[PDB]
Amino acid sequence: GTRQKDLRERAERVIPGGMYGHESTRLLPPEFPQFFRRALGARIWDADEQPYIDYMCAYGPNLLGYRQSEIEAAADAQRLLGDTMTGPSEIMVNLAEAFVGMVRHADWAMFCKNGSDATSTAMVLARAHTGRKTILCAKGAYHGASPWNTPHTAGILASDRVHVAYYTYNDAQSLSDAFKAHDGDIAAVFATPFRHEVFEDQALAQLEFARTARKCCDETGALLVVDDVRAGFRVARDCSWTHLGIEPDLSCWGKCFANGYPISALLGSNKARDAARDIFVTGSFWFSAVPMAAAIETLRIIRETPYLETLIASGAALRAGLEAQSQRHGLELKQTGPAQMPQIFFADDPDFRIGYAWAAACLKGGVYVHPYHNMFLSAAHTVDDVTETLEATDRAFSAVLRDFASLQPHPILM
Amino acid sequence: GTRQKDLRERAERVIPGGMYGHESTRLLPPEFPQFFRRALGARIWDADEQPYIDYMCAYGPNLLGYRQSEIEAAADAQRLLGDTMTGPSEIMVNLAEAFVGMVRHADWAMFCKNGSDATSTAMVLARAHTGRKTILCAKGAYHGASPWNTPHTAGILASDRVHVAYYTYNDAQSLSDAFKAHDGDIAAVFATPFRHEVFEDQALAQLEFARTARKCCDETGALLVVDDVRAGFRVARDCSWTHLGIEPDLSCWGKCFANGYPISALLGSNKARDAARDIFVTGSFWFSAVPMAAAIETLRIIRETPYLETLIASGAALRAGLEAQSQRHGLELKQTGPAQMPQIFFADDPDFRIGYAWAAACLKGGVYVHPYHNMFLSAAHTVDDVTETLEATDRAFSAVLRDFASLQPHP
Ligand SMILES: Cc1ncc(COP(=O)(O)O)c(CN)c1O
Ligand SMILES: Cc1ncc(COP(=O)(O)O)c(CN)c1O
Ligand SMILES: [Mg+2]
Q1: How many CA atoms lie within 13 A of B179 on its CB side?
Q2: What angle do CA A112, A87, A89 make, to 5 degrees?
Q3: In angstroms, what is the span from residue A325 Cα to ligand 1's centroid?
Q4: Name one Pfam family in it (chain A).
């Protein structure tokens, strides 16, 4: 609309490319809005005041609803006291106690801003702890956008990641072999708790893979690092490997544990405490109290309320509804990963032209779904939201069938 | 006091060493409180409700006073709309226009969280722009706590910084020599706008040094990056090298441009725009609107009010007062760098025993000063605050003289 077009014209002049990073719409159909005006519960409004039921949950942070009144009350109370001060607030202690108490593997916490801050801290910690160099990551796994791990390597030197080595996710043989390929020199294994990457089907972690990670780390003294920045608190009320009976040495957390306030965390066992004290990591904003107050109230709600069961039920209902609509319209889906963090692709759609068209058509019905990145459910998504969503998705399936002969892949994608 | 001691005991159990990073009190005298309860204007209150006139300004962020009412009203207005959303707020555009408008060398802005995010982005951008490897930094200059730049190297590999090379700050010949030592391979020169580092006297940047940096960059196509995360908006209303007449290609900003709200920025000229589009930098929280709304209002106040002149006047008064006071007591100071971001050391105090004792004695008088790290003035510090500060500093000078024979360095 008129406001979006003005904003895009202006943005291109003063922001490289008009926008950047994971929230850029550059690889989405052109009808996706870039700039928003407001948000509440499970909904966002674009600059032209069109509402969307939001299945990105702000790319993860919106766990409980935008402007959730209890979290905003806790943030308000802390803001009357102080935020970014010469030292941390006393409540930093309360937050570390609360987080450590919830995470069975952890005896301590460190707070930072970005999830990338937490994964980088984990990497440096493991090198200090072991005196070894090699960090093992799954090929194509996203752990942040630092030089060591950013997925797109313009301006990145080989030397920035020369001591990162790779294994195939969910392949126990591949991981075992990676330990032996750098025999005696493994500082850490990083693993996301499931496979959650762009343009790729999701897949749950396999027990044998997770056991092999834990066993090889135990045998060698390497630290097991679960990167829970994305899945944290939508799989479980603890580390997302809890249900596999596999406890890491370090876990990284972010996005949603203050329901949108900027704070991330490294949780660590006592095994790793000395190395955590030896490294030097910090930032201007890492000791700010208002995000910590929001985190304390979010963690309370996580502990004390059926938020998790609620958002999973909404996810499951959406999944079932799309399966049924899929069969009716003759357009097979691949719905993968947990229903509460779903990847929803079309079968037999290798250039994504079908998925792109369908996602764009859902916008016209007031639904924001994503053709290449996993989605997310919030505890604020209602049974009514899901019913209304499925009316939009029905029409989107019809629009894709109607326009099927004229569909084109995204040019920049191509 | 009692609450501080309970908190340190509890902290030790659930946080490595009870605290970490630049706000840890580990290297300060033991009477420095680690944990605080509240903050307002130029004052902080510790966990035992003792007020201090605060000369750290939260280590830079507090430019206009804690809980500054206009910035909080602007933050409130945005919070009723939305903060961390599926895309940025429309106000991201307003913020970029405002920041670009204020910064003469800049045509575009990118926003992030940490100052370290901005400096890292500048590094990657320069390598993408030039296709070269070597980043030149001043020996001992702090640009963040990433693997490539962190000052303490536990867990850091040689390979993390093998393409960072060093020059001597304020030494034009050293910088020129460093270009030639990596001939045709310089991606960027990073410089803080003055020397501002721990345990060291500060020094203003020399014109010939800055001109050399600009000229060597111009000749080689390397990018000149001014790291203004610390000094930004306390030296000038533009890049802190504005008074030298030297414009960088990139400048890095953070700490105070949203008066405590967490947001940082890379500002760049069109020369660097293509490379800025080519690199991939992002974060979950980098597109949040409320820090951007605080930033817009902070930047307006910076442009439209005499905040700079106010904090400079306060810094100048404090410096002249301490000069006179120290001389009366026969204890010479080294007050270095800008008066509004002062380093206050004692002459002939190589193990900091005197400065530590003095700084500790200031706490008893309700004044928070730092014996090894530069301090900061805010526009909320008043003439009466300086007068009251000087009463406490006087007593601290007397305390140091009384206990002089017994002073011991920090363990
Ligand atoms: C000049 C300079 N540059 C970069 C940084 C990094 O900022 P942050 O701590 O917010 O990551 C700092 C922080 N002291 C700084 O002083
Ligand atoms: C699993 C995972 N780890 C780390 C990060 C990095 O977090 P941030 O973008 O907040 O720096 C992300 C962000 N997508 C993530 O999904
Ligand atoms: Mg625990």
Answers
A1: 21
A2: 80
A3: 53
A4: Aminotran_3
Chain position carrying tokens 């966990």: B47
Domain edges within chain B:
1-68+305-411, 69-304
Among the listed residues B108, B82, B104, the one whose alpha carbon sits nearest the alpha carbon of residue B95: B108
Q: Which residues of chain A does B368 touch, with a Cβ-Cβ cutoff of 8 Å?
A: 86
The answer to whether the beta carbons of residues B247 and B225 sit under 8 Å apart is no
Q: How far is the CA of A371 from the centre of ligand 2 (A)?
A: 19
Q: Are A30 and A16 in contact (CB under 8 A)?
A: no
d(CA B88, CA A37): 9
Q: Do B15 and A157 touch (CB under 8 A)?
A: no
Distance, in Å, from the CA atom of B46 to the CA atom of A87, rounded to the nearest integer, reads 9
C-alpha torsion B297→B299→B302→B304, nearest 10 = -70
Query: Residue A321 and residue A344: Cα distance in Å, rounded?
Result: 13
Residue B88 CB coordination number (10 Å): 27
Please state, as a whole number, how many other Cβ atoms lie within 10 Å of the Cβ of residue A131: 11
How far is ligand 3, taken at its centre, from the CA of residue B77, in Å?
38
What tokens were used for A349? 């759609």
Q: Does B233 touch chain A if contact means CB atoms closer than 8 Å?
A: no
* Out of A11, A22, A154, closest to residue B279 by CB: A154
Signed CA dihedral, A374, A378, A383, A384: sign only: negative
Q: What is the dihedral sign for C-alpha A77, A83, A86, A91?
A: positive
Q: Which residue has the tokens 């961390």?
A: B84
Strands (E), A196-332: 203-204, 223-227, 250-253, 264-268
Token reading at B405: 């024979």
Residues in chain B preceding a C-to-N separation beyond 2.5 angstroms (breaks): none
What is the C-alpha separation between B138 and B127, in angstroms, rounded? 18
Residue A121 contacts residue A279 (beta carbons within 8 Å): yes
Instruction: Tell which B residues from 131 to 160 touch A, by Cβ distance under 8 Å.
Output: 133, 144-148, 150-152, 154-157, 159-160
Q: What is the 3-state secondary structure of B323-370?
A: HHHHHHCCCCEEEECCCCCCEEEECCCCCCHHHHHHHHHHHHCCEECC
Give the Cα separation of B33 and B49 in Å (integer). Answer: 11
**Cα B180 from Cα A314, distance rounded (Å):** 63
- Ligand that lies nearest to the alpha carbon of residue A103, given by its number in the listed order: 3
Integer Cα distance of B244 and B211 in angstroms: 8
- Substitution site in B56, B59, B119 for ligand 1 pocket (most atoms within 8 Å of beta carbon): B119
Which of B284, B287, B299 is most worth mutating to test chain A (most A CB atoms within 10 A of its CB)? B284
Contacts for B325 with CB less than 8 Å, ≥ 6 apart: B390, B393, B394, B397
DSSP per position, B382-402 = -HHHHHHHHHHHHHHHHHHHH
Sign of the Cα pseudo-torsion (A359, A332, A349, A139, in order): positive
Q: Which residues pair with A137 in a beta bridge?
A: A166
- Reduce the DSSP state of residue A390 to 3 states and report it: helix
> Angle, to 10 degrees, between the axis of helix A69-79 and the axis of helix A289-304?
150
Distance from CA of B208 to the nearest CA of A (A): 30
Mutate to test the interface with B, among A9, A72, A80, A84 (most CBs of B within 10 A): A84
- Among A272, A263, A320, A332, smallest CA distance to A297 is for A263
Question: Which residue carries 């995010």 as its tokens?
Answer: B117
Q: Give me the helices (H) in A186-243, please.
A: 207-220
Give the whole-angstrom CA distance, residue A104 versus residue B348.
52
The experimental method is X-ray
Structure tokens belonging to residue A369: 């779904």
Ligand 2 centre from A66 Cα, in Å? 20
Q: Kindly determine whether residue B90 and residue A3, on different chains, have CB atoms separated by under 8 Å.
A: yes
User: How far is it, in rounded angstroms, from Cα A176 to Cα A219?
Assistant: 11
Contact A103, A239 (CB under 8 A): yes
